[PDB]
């Protein structure tokens, strides 16, 4: 019964990773039943990415321009279609590893496991959270474009993210697999800044509950709050709001621990104003916001 930054098992997703090259441009794609998803800029040239014309460039290219190799097999490409800022590459062959899947636009704060790939090969797996400012801080190098973010729910893999760029501040931005960018970003090779980032409040509650499960009660305070009240202090400390629905989201964990959410709110509210007092929680000197409520359950239940 510890608590670690835990990722979903990757094997299903590893079986759908492709290398996609156009000319001298190489990226990663995700190959599910006969179609291959990869960022549209795979077509773009160095000099072209400063000011690309994507529609124009796609008219110029033909199906033969796109060379997709899964392992030691080349894939024959029958079609070149732009889906917003994502390319859909039709192949003759269809991935026999294609699992039960959906394409989900997660919310800011939702966590997901990122499978990092270079040359369509996995280099490993880590967990990241959708920052409220619509950025993700993971571990992305060149060759990473097209790597994917995902949750696993029973048999289904819920794909949430495709990687495109690292910002000048060193954070990372991407799209959903419908090609819709998260946050206020475009796939130009220009410096772009996010916004001012904020702490995910419901995630922190989840984390304090996780401590109470690992025998930490010291932060618990037997006074009470209101949502309205608590939220007004949370805005002073640049915290994301809490909503009733969040309380229901946390209810299950509230059941196991026997601490009503507002009791745990009242504890946090005090940790924000007075700081952390030089104590440690789950072996952090800092408050943690990149664990979701279900993440707390799943990891401390061993969900699969």
């Amino acid at each position: 019964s510890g608590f670690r930054k835990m990722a979903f098992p990757s094997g299903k997703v590893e079986g759908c990773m492709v290398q996609v090259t156009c000319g001298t441009t190489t990226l990663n794609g995700l190959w599910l039943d006969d179609v291959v998803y990869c960022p549209r800029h795979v077509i773009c040239t160095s000099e072209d990415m400063l000011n690309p014309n994507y529609e124009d460039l796609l008219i110029r290219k033909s199906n033969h321009n796109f060379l997709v190799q899964a392992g030691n097999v080349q894939l024959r490409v029958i079609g070149h279609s732009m889906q917003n800022c994502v390319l859909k590459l039709k192949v003759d062959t269809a991935n026999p590893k294609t699992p039960k899947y959906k394409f989900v636009r997660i919310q800011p704060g939702q966590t997901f496991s990122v499978l990092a790939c270079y040359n369509g090969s996995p280099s490993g797996v880590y967990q990241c959270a959708m920052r409220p400012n619509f950025t993700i801080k993971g571990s992305f190098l060149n060759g990473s474009c097209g790597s994917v973010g995902f949750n696993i729910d029973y048999d289904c893999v819920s794909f949430c993210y495709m990687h495109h760029m690292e910002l000048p501040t060193g954070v990372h931005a991407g799209t959903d697999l419908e090609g819709n960018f998260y946050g206020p970003f475009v796939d130009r090779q220009t410096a772009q800044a996010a916004g001012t980032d904020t702490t995910i409040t419901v995630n922190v509650l989840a984390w304090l509950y996780a401590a109470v499960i690992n025998g930490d009660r010291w932060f618990l305070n037997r006074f009470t709050t209101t949502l309205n009240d608590f939220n007004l202090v949370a805005m002073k400390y640049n915290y994301e709001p809490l909503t009733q629905d969040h309380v229901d989201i946390l209810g299950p964990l509230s059941a196991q621990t026997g601490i009503a959410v507002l009791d745990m709110c009242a504890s946090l509210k005090e940790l924000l104003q007075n700081g952390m007092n030089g104590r440690t929680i789950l072996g952090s000197a800092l408050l943690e916001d990149e664990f979701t409520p279900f993440d707390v359950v799943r990891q401390c239940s061993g969900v699969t």
């Binding site: 800029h41 474009c145 495109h164 760029m165």
Partner: peptide
């Protein structure tokens, strides 16, 4: 940068 790739060089960070 834009986290693309080449075929043999680096074009980075």
């Amino acid at each position: 940068x834009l986290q693309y790739a080449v075929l043999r060089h680096k074009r980075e960070x």
